[PDB]
């Protein structure tokens, strides 16, 4: 499995943000004792996106001029990646 790393939606006119990502899921059954699940939302990562989201929350809620970010289709939402902490 290899999907996109978690991102942050941000709506401009409304000025409202929120994290998002792809959640894998499967039919429930017995587990495995010798296995702690790896990072599945952010594959092949040390799970820093949580820290980046926590750090960037103050930046985003305070009001960010994200005109330099791509949009999502024809809506008012733009995607901010959580690869590195957001300062702007």
């Amino acid at each position: 499995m290899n999907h996109e790393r978690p991102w942050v939606f941000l709506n401009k006119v409304t000025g409202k943000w929120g994290a998002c990502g792809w959640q894998p899921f499967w039919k429930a059954t017995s587990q495995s004792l010798n296995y702690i699940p790896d990072n599945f939302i952010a594959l092949r990562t040390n799970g820093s996106w949580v820290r980046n989201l926590w750090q960037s929350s103050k930046v985003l809620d305070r009001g960010l001029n994200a005109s330099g970010y791509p949009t999502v289709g024809t809506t008012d939402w733009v995607r901010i990646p959580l690869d590195a902490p957001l300062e702007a």
Binding site: E4, F9, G15, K16, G18, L60, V72, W77
Partner: protein, 55 residues
């Protein structure tokens, strides 16, 4: 001790609050998930799905 200093600093910090308590502008997760499915290509079918489908 450094442990005592850190504990006291954290205790004072949480009085101010945490993002889950202080953040005002924040969308519900259902709206975000619906937007994800309605606009972005599925990572399996490589196309845009209307909504959530089991198969």
């Amino acid at each position: 001790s450094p442990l005592e200093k850190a504990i006291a600093e954290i205790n004072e910090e949480i009085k101010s609050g945490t993002p889950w308590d202080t953040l005002k502008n924040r969308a519900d997760p259902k709206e975000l998930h619906a937007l994800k499915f309605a606009q972005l290509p599925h990572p399996i079918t490589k196309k845009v799905e209307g909504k959530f489908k089991y198969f």
